[PDB]
Each structure stands twice: as structure tokens, then as C-alpha cells.
């Protein structure tokens, strides 16, 4: 279970099937076949690992959007859009909508 | 120096402030050496609380941006489109929106 | 001195200086425990702080309504902005969108 | 209940709690508590009154859109957008949309 | 010659001169007492005011329809405007877009 | 000479000239008393007048189809505009959008 | 009658004139002002179906146009990107989930 | 050489040359009758025409996939283009949209 | 080999937008290369779609790196950084908010 996690991290970081698979610690001579089955047997974990890796970088972008909202030297529209986004994360959304349908 | 939940709160703050996972790990109070493993498990076992803390911090910093949008809505020397978008945003925050749209259903 | 008003001042201080510690030390407590004691007030009263910020935005809303009306009636700005302002004010008046037909299959 | 509506219009025009409060006829010293409680207890009607005040300019917006739609010296895109808006108000909408489920 | 004509004239005056007090003075009453009864009379006929505004914009819609057709057929404007006008008029004709599929979960 | 074709001419004149009084005087009746009975006449024949206006608006669709096809076939047109025209005609041809899945909570 | 209706619809689509289309419908030129309104309104559904088929028959041309604009290296990258997006949307790769949460 | 082979070749020729009479003569039929037989021939086999055009659109999908991937991997492009390419390729990759809360009123 | 060459054929169609060269290089019956391919496409359209989907999806980490780095580059236009941050937060799980509905039957 540790080799598959390391393979997922290496594939997520260096975008290569054969290079990451040979970097896992396995046989070099057959690096085109066994790798498709190994990827086919752990698709759920690969998706989960890539999703959590993408999600773990959120604080840096949150800091970036907050800083652009408070930096006076950037265009005002960008600050307005950043403030709108962060306030929308705070929890204030849109309002009423009515539907008519009886046939 | 102890109470690992306080160290976890410091870890969350360090991850929120610095653009390096290794620096955050060294700032938590753990062993710096061999920084290739033993870090993924610590990062993965408390992801839910990390997300909750990030959400609470963003919501607590939202009022500063609300003040910013209000002040830009109150700036007379700024472009009209920016003022219009700010006014739309704050009025939508007050709770007054758009109206109906009709749907017809067929067998 | 009455309670719930000090919470209103605390909410305003947090809204103004984008920092929890400065608002907490300025409200009514001591320095020795300024990282924890503030967490119970913030986590147990999140609903009231959100309500206070929303009510302040709503109380400043009439100024923005006046602003959008004046921009809609000021000819010194680009025509698109006036058109968008007129559309928004008419949508606020109570005139919405039109028909949409749906057919469902299996 | 005319005084509350007058208070709402005065607050809408002079954008200040203290100035509107003193224009109501009240005490200068109590500008942080009692006015917040009265506003919190009559927010629904205050909001309705400000909405009707903004809505009373709807004929002005109709005049603005009609006059802007008929100017030949203005850029074509705005004339098109005005025509689209007025036609959407006229009562002509979009067309059919189908739903397919394949669970 | 009835208060229905005074109400229609009042609505038209508000539409053509964007002011409540002057419109009320144009209704036929004393100008000085324009702050008290006009708000109640204005609020008691909000539905009719909205209906009149809607009917007026719908009756002036054909001029805008002619304008949008002419801009769709006017060669001196940039192509994007002609395309958007043609798309709008064709969508009005009754030829629209197609399906979107839905997946439901438990 | 019957109310159906006279009403059709009334609708066509209203569609062409953008004037209520001109259309009514073209109908064939007395010009002066055009302010009172006209509200009842419009209220009693609004549905067919609106249907006629919609039919006239929809009948110009072949012109818009020709315009969108020619703009899609002009190499001197902006690439985005040609792409949008091709998208519009293909979406009318019968190729639409795709899946949308929902996750539900009790 | 269905072929005269087809020619009438095509003439209306191409020669932008109601009088020309009606006279092309094979009828008398002089009395071309009255019968034409009933004739046009009595077959609106078939006219719409034929015109829809006419607009759809040029769809392969739009396919060729979008492919050619997507394959031109001298075009801005955004236009090629949007053309690829559109062609993929027909290819069978679409958007993803949207969740609804209710509070009641 | 089969009649379905002549018809699919006709569909491909219509897709390539964009002329009905030329496409009809390219189908394998008589040139002198290019106005009559062509309307019924196109109307009676619309389903297969739609299937053929859909297959032609689907067979070029790898080129568009390569284009979007290279645009996401092209360093000389403006930031908006790279961002849109990356977002689109991830949308196909399988990471969904945001969350939405719904409020209902009786 | 019945099925690994078929996977190679799927990849060849995904990469080089052609049919005759890929079909002759796969190892199949050349004399009937216009028909046999229609039968294989009709019998394996779902598998072809799955393979092309995997081909497009497997490059996702490169684009994720691109969007993350654009969010962290100070020399890029502000709108681009804002949109990148919006996308990364949308993946984190914070989107737009509530909508209220009123029904009249």
C-alpha cells in the first residue's frame, strides 16, 4: 500500500507513466505492460490522492486572493472580484426565484 | 511545547501562511531530517480539520473585504462599472434579488 | 452597561481591523490569555457576528441604492453602465424573465 | 406608522444613523443601542420601504432605456442590448429544452 | 374626464419627468402639501403603476423590434452586433437549443 | 371589409409606425374620442394583437438564417463570430449539451 | 399540394419578398395581396419544419468551418481553444456534478 | 458501391463541398435532375445523415484533445488561454463543480 | 495477441488522427480496412470512448501544476491569478451559495 501511494505521488508530481513506475522500484525491462495493470487495479486511490494533493494547496491561493484584495497597486476591479469571492465563501448568496407550471 | 492540538493549530496557521510544506513541518516542532516521508501520513490524517480551519479563517477575514467593497462603492473618483458591480453585490447581500421564470412540462 | 452591545462593538472591531487579537484586547479582557479565551466567543457566537455584518451591509444598502440610481441618471458615464443600472433597478422593481418550455423523455 | 417611513427615507438620503436619528427628533446620546434595537425590530418594513423608494424610479429607468435605444449616434452594441432588454420585458422568451436521464 | 385620467396622467408625468412632487402638483392639487398624502396615494396604486409601466414598455417594444431588425440588416456595424441581433430574432422565431442529460443519485 | 382583416391592418400599422393614435386613425374611426374607448379596445383584443406581433417577428426568421449563414461563411469575419454562428446553426440542427449529475442529502 | 409549398418556402427563404414568393407559388400576379395571408398561415407548421431542415442541411458546412478554424495556426489561441471545446462537446465528453442541499 | 455506400459518400461529399446539386451528382446519379429527386432523397434519410455527421465530428476529437492539451502546455500563450485550457482538461479529467444549498418556500 | 494490440490501436487513434497507417501497423486484415473497422467501432464504441477519456484525463496533473504555478506567479495579470485561485478553491470545496425557491401550484 506504500508503493502504490508513492507511485501516485510520483505520477502526480512528474507526469510520466514509465518514468514514475521505474522510480517506484520495479523491473525496468517490462515497463510498458505491468504498469497498465497496476494503474487499472488502483484507480480509486489514484483519483483520491490526486484530489487531496490538489486540495492541499488551497491556503496559498486563499492568501493570494486576500492579498490582492488588500493591495492598492492592483486594478480596482480585481480587488472587487476578489472581495466578492471571499465574501461568497463567507456565506452570503443569491435570492428568491419563482416558478410557474401547471399544464 | 506540548498539547499536539495546539501544535496542529500552529501547523494549520503555518501552512496557511507559508508556501512550503517542509517549512511548515519543521515549524510544527518535529524532526526536520529525512523530509521525504513520514509527512504524508501527518498531512492526510487531519485533512477535515484543516479544511474546517481554512473555512473559518476565510470567513473571519471576509469582513475586511466587505469593508473594501463598501469603500470602493463609496469612492467617487472610481470608474462607474466598478461602483455598479459593488452596489449590485452589496444589495444582493442585503437580500433583494431577481424574479420569476416560467417552465412548461410535456408528457 | 449592558451585554450584547459589547458583542456588537466586538463585531465592528473585528470588521475594522481584520485581526482577532486587537479587537479582543480592546473589548474587555486581559492580555495573559488572548489566543484561547477569544476562540470560545468566536466559535460559540458565529451566528450573531454573521448577522451583525449582514445587518451593517443592509443598513449601508440605501446609500448604494442611491448610488445606482444616480449613476443611472448621470449622462457623464458610458452608456452601457446606465443600461445595466436601469436593468438592475427595473429587476428590483419586480419585472423578471419569460417563458421556458421543457419536454422530458425516458 | 408614518414616522418610521419618514425615518427610512431620511436614512436613505443622508446615509447616517445619527443624522437620521436626530432628524427623527431623538436624543443624540443614544445613537448606538436604542437605534439598533428599533432597526432590528422593524427591519422588514424598513427594507420594504426602501425597496418601494427605489422602485418609484422605475418609470425613470424606462425613459432612460427608451431614449438610449433610439440614439443613432451611440454605439450599436448598447442599442442592441437595450432592444434585447425591452423585448424580454415585452413578453418573448427562449425556446424548448429537453431532459434525459440515464442512471 | 375622471380620476382614472388623472391617475394615468400622474403615471405619465412620473415617467416623463422623474419626480414625485412635480407629478403630484401636475395631478391638480396644492404644491405645498406634497409630502404627506402623496406617499399613501402612491403606495395604494402600486399595482396599477407597475401595470401601466409594463403596458407602455410593451407598446413601445415594436420600435425597438424595428431597430434590432435594422441593425441586424445594417451593413455598417461590426459583425458581432449583426450576429447577436440575428440570433435574438431567430430565437424569437421559435428555433432553439437542444438536450442536457441528468444523473440522479441516492 | 370585416373586423378580422381590419384588425390585421391595425396590427400591421402598429408594427410599422410606432404610434397609437396613428394606428387608430388608420383603423377608420373618429379621431377625437381616442382616449377612453381605446383602453377597453386594447384590453379586449390584446391577445390577438400580441399574437400577430409575435407572428410578424417570427416570420423574418429566414432573413436571420441567411445572415447567420453568410456571417459564418465570411472569411473576413472575426474567428469568434464565425465560431458562434456555426455553433448556433448546429445547435438548431439538433446537437445539444450533456450530462449533469446531482448528489442529494436527506 | 406539397411541391408547390416546398418551392414557395424556398422562394420566401431566398428572394426576400412576399409578393415575389406568392407569384412564384404559381398563381396570378395581379391578385397577389389577399389569398396570400391565409395561404401562409394555414401551413405554418410544415413551413417551419421545411425551413428547419434547410438550416440543418448546412450543418456539415459548419462542421467543416469549425474544424478549419481550429486547424489554422495563424489564428489566436483562444479561438482554436473554443473550437476544440465545441467539437469535444459534440464528441461526447461533458461537464460534471452539481449538488443540491435543502434546508426545511 | 452499395446504395448505402452511395448515400454515405453523398453525406461526406455534402460535408466537403457544400452544394446540393454537386453533392447529388457526386452521389452517383443523373446531373439533369438535380432539383427534384434531391429534396425527397434528403428528407427520407435524415437519420443516417445525422449519424454520419455525428461520426465525422467524433472522428476528429483526438485532434481537438491534442490542441487543448498543447495549449495547456504551450508556454508562449497568454495566461487566460492557459488557465481555460487547464480548467477544461480537468473538467474532462473528472473533478466536479461546487456545492449549492436550496431554500424552499411554501 | 487479441486485446493488447487493440489497446495500442486505441492509443494510436487517440494520438495520430488517422486510420490506415494505424490499422496496418496494428496487425489486422489489410485487404478489408474500410469495413472491419466499422464492425470493430460498432462493437467497441464504449471501450474506444473509455480509452480516449483516459488519454485526455491522464495529463491532468500537468494542468493542475500549471494552474497552481500561475496562481503563485506574481508577474501575471491579476485577473488570471484571481481565476486560478477561484478554480483551486472550487476544487477545495468552496463555491457559490444558496438560492431560495417559492412554488405556486
Author numbering:
A (entry chain H), D (entry chain B): 23 to 125
B (entry chain I): 19 to 125
C (entry chain A), E (entry chain C), F (entry chain D), H (entry chain F): 20 to 125
G (entry chain E): 22 to 125
I (entry chain G): 21 to 125
The authors write:
NV1 TerS crystallized in a large monoclinic unit cell with five nonamers in the AU that diffracted weakly to 3.95 Å resolution. The structure of NV1 TerS was then solved by MR using the model of PaP3 TerS and refined to an Rwork/Rfree of 25.9/29.1% at 3.95 Å resolution, enforcing 81-fold NCS torsion restraints. NV1 and PaP3 TerSs are virtually identical (RMSD ∼ 1.1), as expected for two proteins that are ∼65% identical in amino acid sequence. Peak 1 and peak 2 had a roughly equal quantity of protein for PaP3 and LUZ24, whereas most of NV1 TerS eluted in peak 2. The same intramolecular plasticity observed in PaP3 likely exists in the TerSs from NV1 and LUZ24. SEC-SAXS of PaP3 and NV1 TerS revealed a radius of gyration (Rg) of 41.44 ± 0.40 Å and 41.33 ± 0.43 Å, respectively,, which is larger than the calculated crystal structure Rg values of 33.84 Å and 33.32 Å, respectively. The distance distribution function P(r) calculated from SAXS data indicates a maximum diameter Dmax ∼131 Å for both PaP3 and NV1 TerS, also about 25% larger than the maximum width of the crystal structure (∼105 Å). Similarly, the NV1 TerS crystal structure docked into the 9-fold electron SAXS density revealed modest agreement between solution and crystal structure (χ2 = 2.55), despite the exceptional quality of this SAXS density. In both cases, the solution structure of TerS had a wider outer diameter than the crystal structure and showed extra density for the missing C-terminal tail. In contrast, using 10- or 8-fold rotational symmetry did not significantly improve the FSC resolution, supporting the notion PaP3 and NV1 TerSs exist in solution as nonamers.
